[PDB]
Write a protein that binds this ligand. Sequence first.
Ligand code: PRO
Ligand code: PRO
Ligand SMILES: [Mn+2]
Ligand SMILES: [Mn+2]
Ligand code: NA
Ligand code: NA
Ligand SMILES: [O-]
Ligand SMILES: [O-]
Lengths: 484, 482
Amino acid sequence: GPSFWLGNETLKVPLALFALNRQRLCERLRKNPAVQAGSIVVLQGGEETQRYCTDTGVLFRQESFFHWAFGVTEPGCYGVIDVDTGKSTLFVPRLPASHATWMGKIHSKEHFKEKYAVDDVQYVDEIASVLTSQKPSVLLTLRGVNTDSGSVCREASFDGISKFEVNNTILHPEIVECRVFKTDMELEVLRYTNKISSEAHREVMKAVKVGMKEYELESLFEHYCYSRGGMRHSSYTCICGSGENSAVLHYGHAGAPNDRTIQNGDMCLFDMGGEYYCFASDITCSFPANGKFTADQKAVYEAVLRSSRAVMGAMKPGVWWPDMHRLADRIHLEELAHMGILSGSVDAMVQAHLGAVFMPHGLGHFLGIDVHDVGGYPEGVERIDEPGLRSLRTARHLQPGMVLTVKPGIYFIDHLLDEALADPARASFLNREVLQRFRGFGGVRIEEDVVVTDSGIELLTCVPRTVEEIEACMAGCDKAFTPF
Amino acid sequence: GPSFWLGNETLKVPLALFALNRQRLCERLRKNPAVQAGSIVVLQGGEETQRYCTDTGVLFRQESFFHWAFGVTEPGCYGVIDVDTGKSTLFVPRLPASHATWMGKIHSKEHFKEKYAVDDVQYVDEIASVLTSQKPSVLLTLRGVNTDSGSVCREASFDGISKFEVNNTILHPEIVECRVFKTDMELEVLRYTNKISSEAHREVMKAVKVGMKEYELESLFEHYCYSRGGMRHSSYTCICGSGENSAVLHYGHAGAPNDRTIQNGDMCLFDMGGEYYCFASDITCSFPANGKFTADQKAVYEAVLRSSRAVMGAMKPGVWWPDMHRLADRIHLEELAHMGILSGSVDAMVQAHLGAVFMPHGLGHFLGIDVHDVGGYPEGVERIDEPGLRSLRTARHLQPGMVLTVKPGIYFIDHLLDEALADPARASFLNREVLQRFRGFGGVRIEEDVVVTDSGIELLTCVPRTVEEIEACMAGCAFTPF
Ligand code: PRO
Ligand code: PRO
Ligand SMILES: [Mn+2]
Ligand SMILES: [Mn+2]
Ligand code: NA
Ligand code: NA
Ligand SMILES: [O-]
Ligand SMILES: [O-]
């Protein structure tokens, strides 16, 4: 069948990938007691947008549920799926003649049918007529709450939909659950996004020089990803934190826009991941700006390397993800004590939630169509009300087919450290004489993308990780490393 | 005073630029007989957004009127200007403690006051209280219609604004008119955006090889602009049309995403412009993919070079922009006749609107903080309902301080050609046997950015333009990323 491809050495993605997602969704819905015969799933694609009130077009990126079901790159579409038969119909915009002048060829419906390997193609303005002719029992539309943003998914609507029976409660948890479990075809794409982003991270490590602006490496990363990988988008805004900025978890946004000059002695924390055909990657590399770890940098870095590898070694089906977070916390505390930053009983440190001072974010999250992927907190799964753990984006147990980021880190964040020092329950663990040395250090984060398998995990990411490997890469020796 | 700067060799932009814009706006408003004493201009800045229902942040780019007045890069702000005194107050978000963990330093109000060189800074949640104490007659807010998008400008609103008298009609025409005329400080930024984008176009011409994907050059262009120019954004989505795609005017969008392989014998039409601190550039270069113009390519290319230079040579204060568009049409028709594509009276061709078959878009437009800048069709300036001219984004007369793109082109667009061939009023001019050879040629566009001066224009763009210059540039043996 047909494939999405951007030529050169980019990945051919079979449109069969999306056909399989539609089949899986129907199979799940048919087993749902709330679903009656003759139901039709109705999804609305994203539309073109502009900057504010201007005619400056914003580059269109498809809505993630719609992409998952159809793989369609054009704005203004709808898509429906007959649950009982699996029959898929794509609705495409009926374009004005002038489109041919300004935007390009006005493709036929048959062109789109062949391109996307759907069963039928119709024009958007015909959706009420076409659905009326099929005499559905109920239309199943998308509405639910994203547990990372708090936003409500946009339910499909069209002229005449009020004449149909519409249910907007059934679909969301079911299509979310399908997205949680990646197919082998989806894993092929995520292997590829990790391949290209890993290569780009290695090029950045080779290119980094003291005196550069952070954004020079953002630019280089995205250029590798696009020109070599066909990744027109990143999965999220690049985080290129040097020096103290490496303690800022989502550094690089408009308010802190990767605009610091990299200094000798700084640590760098570069959290970047290209997106290919709306599939994510998320990789974080930490390294010394000048290519040589100091003793202090090595100690903090290897503490996080230890927790990274311990978690990857422990992950397998049945493991409760919050237990992996607590494992990372315990290892960070052990290593911070071994460094002289902390002293006393590590058991007592754990009981006092001291780990969250140094890692105030969740250990990792689902990854897929969205970098913070859906389904972390389905009904019944509760957020843990403790420091650090409350920021986990899932409290689920691991099962084969899930894709997770594993992103432990240690940071020196002044207001968190100062809170701890003001707190009798935590203050005694801290050795200020040693800690003062790490004020303004920033932090280290080491992030891998992995698949949960029957036997453990498959590591997708391929970047240098030991001190020796990283120093070699920065010296231009990027291939001299061996993944976990 | 303070300046915006992204280090290295990037441009230092004084915040005085925005203070001058605020002064100019107040001066204009004070002369408006409808404006009451004690009026306060109230603008609302852009807010952070995400992709659909996800938590995937979209990189924030400031709303253009707000940027013009304040130069503020942070989301979630408001800004007000006392019309009578010119006093400026910026309102910034009161951030939660956790911002320091996730997003960065929680700057003081004093930090923002010094950064932006405004008269005062307050928190957004105090805007009603602050405005109340100033006892304004009327709040002047922004509402009007953009004549390129047809969208309505988003009017400022805040909790408690209902307690004020608000006028949303006066401001828009006045702040639009101010934006039409660029200050010397604004022109310095537009010289810089043209400089970097010109350099990036030259690098692309040197890098193009047969067999590359169009998007490889989009990527290279944006990388040059960001890494060397500090241009995090482009002014618009890059248009990298090779072969027949060079006839597609806004090629490169998600539906036609710069994904063709460049072939031997193709013409390339690359329309790209980096954005610096929300100031635009817009440059188009046309050239043969293989570095050597054929006879047919040279003829079409030099026709557009001729109209480009003729229009630039005629531009000066008082010139009616639609007359320049018609000048370009007449030149294109003359040249297409010399080539043998057309035969007959060029006068009669013009009367039949044949020029619009080959150039269906407007000759050019205002450029500034938006690439299609505001103010092309103020009240009293009408759109001309004729082929080609109806797509002009302004029908104004030129005045000093206006910044315009000059972008003639000739394209071979099947459905326009087919219409013309069916129409007896136009078909007689077209020589089918010659035209057939140019089906699938694509097109040529040559686009310069210029400023109207007291006596003529100033050219901002600097790329190779003659056939000799282009061939020498592409044969050049500087920018090696990895
Ligand atoms: O938002 C999150 O969950 C991770 C934590 C470090 C940066 N991104
Ligand atoms: O939209 C416009 O006015 C110009 C025409 C060529 C492409 N951009
Ligand atoms: Mn990340
Ligand atoms: Mn242009
Ligand atoms: Na190096
Ligand atoms: Na900029
Ligand atoms: O991350
Ligand atoms: O253009």
